[PDB]
Amino acid sequence: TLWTTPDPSPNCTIDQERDSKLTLVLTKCGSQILANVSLLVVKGKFSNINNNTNPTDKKITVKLLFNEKGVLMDSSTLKKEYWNYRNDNSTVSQAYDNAVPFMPNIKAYPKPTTEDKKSAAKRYIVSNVYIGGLPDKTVVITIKFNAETECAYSITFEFTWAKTFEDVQFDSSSFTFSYIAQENE
Amino acid sequence: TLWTTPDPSPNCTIDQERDSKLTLVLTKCGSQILANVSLLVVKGKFSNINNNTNPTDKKITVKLLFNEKGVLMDSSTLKKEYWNYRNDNSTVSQAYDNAVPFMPNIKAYPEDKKSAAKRYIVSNVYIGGLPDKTVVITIKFNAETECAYSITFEFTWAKTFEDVQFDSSSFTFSYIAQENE
Amino acid sequence: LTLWTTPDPSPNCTIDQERDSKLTLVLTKCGSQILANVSLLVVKGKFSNINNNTNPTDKKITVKLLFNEKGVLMDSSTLKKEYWNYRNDNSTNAVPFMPNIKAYPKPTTDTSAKPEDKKSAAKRYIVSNVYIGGLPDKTVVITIKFNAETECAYSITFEFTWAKTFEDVQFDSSSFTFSYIAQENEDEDK
């Protein structure tokens, strides 16, 4: 298991710096990865969403980008702080993370470098997640795997709302999901 | 593995006593908890939902409250009896036993101000696995007083159902654990 | 404790035409629960450019996976047998990856009329929404019924359904995760 230790330490920079708290838990079920994501926006643009005085403010992306060794790159709007393995020994204080088996699968979700035949959607997840747990504030979570340039691997969260919000913090309800990938030989 | 035996023997007090049967499965892949929930109401208020006569009949909550030992309370709207390790051990009691690594994380669950929706899961289930009969399942982790931990199933619908047995499709979810033992 | 399609598989499904379509399903077995993940791409065929302006009734596609006593896949299935197993080659127990029969029993008209239903009608269903090339514009209902088919020991039955009248669309649905409950019962019953 490799996570954003389930405490707050702002660690993620959408509009302003340390902006926000994304709690993302990855847990390695052999072949498949089981993943949980809340996102809480402390300060910044999306601490007050208003689409009367900022209509366009209808979408936030937040990006994790990884190595050959699947370590988190700066070009990620997530900070390498408080992003490690937890084993019951204070491993998360260390940060020697070289965690390639937790990585979206190349064979499943390759880089999108385009007979005429290949899968647009295989590497998308798209559902709905709810602000404050309030069913009126319908938000479209979209998850993309290994879709970004400059990286071996790349998980992309991207929330999107059509209904115009009127002085709304971006707190999102948690979201469970799975992808695959590991070491190949 | 820690479950309400996948077969039906009623265990739930909505409206009437033993009203209905809840199917819930807690499997623990390490520090994360993968869970299944279906719900069939067999006698009473929800057994023939008619909102063309009894409108307010539009919501159903079912709570499980927990101890330091991770044990179910009398204050929980599901019955104690068959709640344990799956088949083999299922009779032998879970009491003296802790069940704390199945308990939702207590640290997990515009200022230093906290999250409102961190301890929510909010989506759609379907009565009959019919698209038309849209329900909205709302879970809420560790949000009940007078208890060490809490898991809280809320099922709402906007559509006025004419003669209908609440009979929820299976829904799948995770939540962060806490696995000292 | 993992059983799949290849993450990047060769056309492994007949829907419309022979070798029609390409189903990436991954079942991983977390103890007493099967974590699952399913994409569908349709390469050639009818559902490679669905055009609901010309064929209104083309608004469903069904993929069934009928199993054995021993959890082996069946000619009857719409998923071809060649590619399957976990990432080694012989073949198969394959049962411990099988939807539990007490939860999702085979549907028999031998059912008590005292209001104690052994299961619900829908307990075995899992109904939600996937999107065709992640474009939210294109809503797709996914529908998994468990053990719902006859002439088999155990079943899995992805049905895909769309309301909206597409034009020239190639059925390529977003990945969907779900769980079902596991059969794996220790033959020895104390």
Author numbering:
A (entry chain B): 187 to 300, 307 to 377
B (entry chain A): 187 to 295, 306 to 377
C (entry chain C): 186 to 277, 284 to 381
What do the authors report?
Each protein forms key interactions to promote cell infection, with the terminal domain of the fiber, the fiber knob protein, interacting with the viruses’ primary cell entry receptor. The adenovirus fiber knob protein is known to have a highly conserved trimeric structure. Sialic acid (SA) usage has been proposed as a cell infection mechanism for EKC causing HAdV-D. Here we highlight an important role for SA engagement by many HAdV-D. We provide apo state crystal structures of 7 previously undetermined HAdV-D fiber-knob proteins, and structures of HAdV-D25, D29, D30 and D53 fiber-knob proteins in complex with SA. Our findings demonstrate a conserved binding site for sialic acid, common across the species D adenoviruses, therefore suggesting that, along with CAR, the receptor can be used to initiate cell entry.
